[PDB]
Automatic annotation (TrEMBL), chain B:
Keywords: Cyclin
Protein name: V-cyclin
Entries under InterPro entries matching the protein: Cyclin, Cyclin-like_dom, Cyclin-like_sf, Cyclin_herpesvir, Cyclin_N, Cyclins_cyclin-box, K-cyclin_C
Signal peptide: none
Domain (Cyclin-like) ranges: 41-125
Family the UniProt entry places it in: Belongs to the cyclin family.
One Pfam family named in its UniProt record: K-cyclin_vir_C
Key word Translocase present: no
């Protein structure tokens, strides 16, 4: 394209190149999101990953899942040999979970809306897993919410920095959704995403993040303070930070923080927020949980 | 119920990768079905030889034939084109992606490393980076499992069926069929009744949700196609 | 300038707010010829409110002939559309094809946005765009029947 899509603003830049907001000139100038990468030619040609990643996106698009953001197009602009400007065009939703949650009136989000969003979230998440794709960076700013109230999973590759008041330290917000296996630099498998679903789930009630760690060792602790120290059987073998590294942790009643959640909600929430990745619920299972009736 | 649900969905996508033998004497003009059968077997050689998984050939052939559906390819460059498909296909499927130099070589050095690279860029542009496809080799496992119930043997037959599948694909006629069909048809032709519970075709047909006659037709067709395969230059 | 626009675009209220304390020009266009209010994160009514509160002019249309209220109305962000009116934005401003926010909301099926326009704004309903169509016509021409009904149950 690049004459059909007209940029209007740069949103930022991160792991997937620069992100812009543009008008789709062949659909009434409706807003669309673009990702632009400068792909490096090798003596081997086009870089494997570049090819693989675009391949997978294009392919998952075939299925048109309602809970994943649409990929409208792929434009190419070859500069010289060594450079090719690659551009992915996606559907754009001018609102994410964060902008929504911290905008709702005081009572909070309707419990019935929390359920509906949560169901859709696991719907699109189950779709990705079932096609052997792991998101690995499920943060609320990657969760799109249409005015209609529809959930669409994104992945902009854009980090957000949060600065701690008194501490004079900062962190990249994603840390707050990172699963323990990941923090302990142990396994990085699919359950990884369920732990985040659990964090996001809890956040819908709180409208404030559940575990706001300042480092990865700090995060780990913030977690064990609530869920309690796992047993010998549930801690990862041969890992840099042993179970012994964290003193006795009781296990406070989750509702103490995910205020106003219900009995079945609490059940699902803890099945996501389960330390041992192998005993953590699956997107498909969660989906079949009596919370959704 | 993980398996069963992915299968069901893959089936809807499926038709999206269908190709057609009808292209040659018309839209192609310069190329003929037989020239394609030659290029195709050469590709087959390079692969199973340079140690590539069957998937790589299955996909490389799908890209080549999907490409021939929108781009008129000359006789002088048919080969180089088949090579670009091979490169891209292994970059997407082998732990051991075959090298440019390696290809240019087996290609009698008929084309330059740059030129092959320029065809890769070209191939990607005409197909708009849509390089993955549901393959008949991608389905054989799930089916082979519903037949050979247990787990034992599941690997001998899988690799066997998929090798047949690739041979049937060297013939452009095969490309007009759904991945599921080509896949079941292949199973049906090799797997002996002694390694299966309890017919094979009515059993697969039941899974694919198609008619027994439809699957049989596919068997029959693919049987013919596979027979013609012959690596003699 | 450009950083204000980008802050509005990524919806960084924090950052946007600094920039707005430096007595900068809220109406300046970025390198794409667009202003911060125009490219702003529509789901965030507060981004809009602050810009408006600092002089942003709601009725400016871009090279492509659109005003924020058009895009908000098209996305169904009623609160934002409402805070826009709250600051005197013109409800009947037409795009370059003679559309009103109403047309676009109707064309998109945003019933609670059509609801509002029809019953609480000076939205000139009968207005026909350059193709002679109406908001309700477009709803009809697009299947937004649910919208068509309500719309005509009123006008």
């Amino acid at each position: 394209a690049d004459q059909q899509y007209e940029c209007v603003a740069e949103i930022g830049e991160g792991a997937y190149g620069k992100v812009f907001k543009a008008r789709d000139l062949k659909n009434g100038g409706r807003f669309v999101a673009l990702k632009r990468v400068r792909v490096q030619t090798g003596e081997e040609g086009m870089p494997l990953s570049t090819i693989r990643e675009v391949a997978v996106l294009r392919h998952l698009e075939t299925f048109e899942h309602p809970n994943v953001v649409r990929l409208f197009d792929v434009c190419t602009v070859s500069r010289t040999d060594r450079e090719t400007k690659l551009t992915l065009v996606f559907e754009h939703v001018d609102q994410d979970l964060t902008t929504y949650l911290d905008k709702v009136p005081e009572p909070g989000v309707p419990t019935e809306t929390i359920k509906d969003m949560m169901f859709q979230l696991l719907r699109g998440l189950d779709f990705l897993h079932s096609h052997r794709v792991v998101h690995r960076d499920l943060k609320p700013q990657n969760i799109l919410v249409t005015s209609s109230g529809q959930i669409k999973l994104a992945d902009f590759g854009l980090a957000r920095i949060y600065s701690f008041q008194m501490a004079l330290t900062s962190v990249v917000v994603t840390l707050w959704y990172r699963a323990p296996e990941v923090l302990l630099q142990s396994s990085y498998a699919t359950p990884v995403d369920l732990w985040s679903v659990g964090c996001i789930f809890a956040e819908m009630f709180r409208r404030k993040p559940l575990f706001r760690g300042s480092s990865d060792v700090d995060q780990l602790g913030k977690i064990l303070d609530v869920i309690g120290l796992p047993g010998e059987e549930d801690w990862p073998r041969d890992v840099a930070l042993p179970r012994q590294a964290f003193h006795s942790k009781s296990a406070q009643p989750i509702e103490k923080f995910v205020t106003d959640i219900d009995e079945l909600g609490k059940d699902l929430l803890l099945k996501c927020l389960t330390f041992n990745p192998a005993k953590r619920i699956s997107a498909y299972s969660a989906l079949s949980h009596p919370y959704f009736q | 119920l993980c398996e069963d649900r992915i299968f069901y969905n893959i089936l809807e996508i499926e038709p999206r990768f269908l190709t057609s033998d009808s292209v040659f004497g018309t839209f192609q003009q310069s190329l003929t079905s037989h020239m394609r059968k030659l290029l195709g077997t050469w590709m087959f050689s390079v692969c199973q030889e340079y140690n590539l998984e069957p998937n790589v050939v299955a996909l490389a052939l799908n890209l080549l034939d999907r490409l021939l559906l929108i781009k008129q390819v000359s006789k002088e460059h048919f080969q180089k084109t088949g090579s670009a498909c091979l490169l891209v296909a292994s970059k997407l499927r082998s732990l051991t992606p075959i090298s440019t130099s390696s290809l240019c070589y087996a290609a009698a050095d008929s084309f330059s490393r740059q030129e092959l690279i320029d065809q890769e860029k070209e191939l990607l542009e005409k197909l708009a980076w849509r390089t993955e496809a549901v393959l008949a080799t991608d389905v054989t496992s799930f089916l082979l499992l519903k037949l050979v119930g247990g787990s034992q043997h599941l690997d001998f037959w899988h690799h066997e069926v998929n090798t047949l599948i690739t041979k049937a694909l060297v013939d452009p006629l095969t490309g007009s069929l759904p991945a599921s069909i080509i896949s079941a048809a292949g199973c049906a032709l090799l797997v002996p009744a002694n390694v299966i519970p309890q017919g094979v075709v009515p059993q697969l047909a039941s899974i694919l949700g198609c008619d027994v006659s439809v699957l049989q037709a596919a068997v029959e067709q693919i049987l013919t196609s596979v027979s013609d395969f012959d690596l003699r230059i | 300038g450009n950083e204000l626009a980008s802050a509005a675009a990524r919806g960084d209220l924090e950052q946007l707010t600094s920039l707005l304390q430096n007595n900068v020009n809220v109406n300046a266009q970025n390198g794409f010829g667009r202003t911060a209010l125009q490219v702003m994160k529509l789901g965030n009514p507060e981004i809009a409110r602050r810009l408006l509160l600092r002089g942003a002019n709601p009725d400016l249309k871009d090279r492509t002939g659109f005003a924020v209220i058009h895009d908000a109305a098209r996305a169904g962000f009623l609160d934002t559309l409402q805070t826009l009116l709250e600051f005197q934005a013109d409800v009947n401003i037409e795009d370059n094809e003679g559309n009103l926010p109403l047309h676009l909301a109707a064309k998109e099926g945003h019933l609670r946005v059509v609801e509002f326009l029809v019953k609480h704004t000076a939205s000139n309903v009968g207005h026909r765009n350059h193709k002679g169509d109406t908001a309700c016509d477009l709803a009809r021409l697009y299947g937004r029947n649910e919208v068509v009904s309500l719309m005509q149950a009123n006008g």
